[PDB]
């Protein structure tokens, strides 16, 4: 086509989606990670995670308002990944990298799994 | 913070949101523009438009499944702007620029209004 493109559009959309999440606006699901609960938008979770994409395209699970993750999932690792979904920024630290990588593998977030593998390899 | 950032994350999210729109997955509103109907995600519309942001934060309108736009709104201009919301690409042509600018002013999409004003000024 002969379209023009606004460079900052995708980033501006994601920024506003994070503002709606922070104010709990039109969030339609709560993700339960052991004792912790995280409110989010199903569409953003599906857009970021192969696991959520599979869950919310399922004809019965698409209608659930609560999703319980596997008890081995670390709430902090999930929190870091949810923040990444809504911002493009990943808070990867020596103290959380193992939990972040395991959570990213479970959530099927291949680019996160990749940078965790590389950061771990450099420390070996 | 000491976060790392994935450059293509926002663009990848928007691409997946457009894929969900194309397959009519988790769309929660229909925008009526005279004889034409457009299915979308309320969160994406709010993230792109000052008008939709105001509509869907309203305590009664947030729950509506159908929104009727002003009868002066051109369906093609709306279609072009909805495509822009979900892709960052604007199909701006001599034959549609007036309708696109008027629709962008109504929808409160200031960056689109700006490029339309500039493209019109160059042709004068």
């Amino acid at each position: 086509d002969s379209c023009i493109q606004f460079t900052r559009h995708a980033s501006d959309v994601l920024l506003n989606l994070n503002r709606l999440r922070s104010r709990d606006i039109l969030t339609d699901v709560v993700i339960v990670v052991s004792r912790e609960q995280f409110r989010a938008h199903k569409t953003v979770l599906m857009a970021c995670s192969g696991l959520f994409y599979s869950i919310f395209t399922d004809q019965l699970k698409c209608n659930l308002s609560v999703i319980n993750l596997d008890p081995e999932i670390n709430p902090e690792g999930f929190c870091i990944l949810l923040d990444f979904m809504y911002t493009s920024r990943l808070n990867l630290r020596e103290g959380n990298i193992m939990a972040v990588m395991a959570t990213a593998m479970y959530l099927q977030m291949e680019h996160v799994v990749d940078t965790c593998r590389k950061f771990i390899k450099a420390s070996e | 913070d000491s976060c790392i950032q994935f450059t293509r994350h926002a663009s990848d999210v928007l691409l997946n949101l457009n894929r969900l729109r194309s397959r009519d997955i988790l769309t929660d509103v229909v925008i009526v523009v005279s004889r034409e109907q457009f299915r979308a995600h309320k969160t994406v519309l709010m993230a792109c438009s000052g008008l939709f942001y105001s509509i869907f934060t309203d305590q009664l309108k947030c729950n509506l499944s159908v929104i009727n736009l002003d009868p002066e709104i051109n369906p093609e201009g709306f279609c072009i702007l909805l495509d822009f919301m979900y892709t960052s690409r604007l199909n701006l042509r001599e034959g549609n620029i007036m309708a696109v600018m008027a629709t962008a002013m109504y929808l409160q999409m200031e960056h689109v209004v700006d490029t339309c004003r500039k493209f019109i000024k160059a042709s004068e």
Binding site: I4, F6 | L90, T115
Partner: peptide
């Protein structure tokens, strides 16, 4: 705005 750019030519993509």
């Amino acid at each position: 705005w750019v030519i993509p």
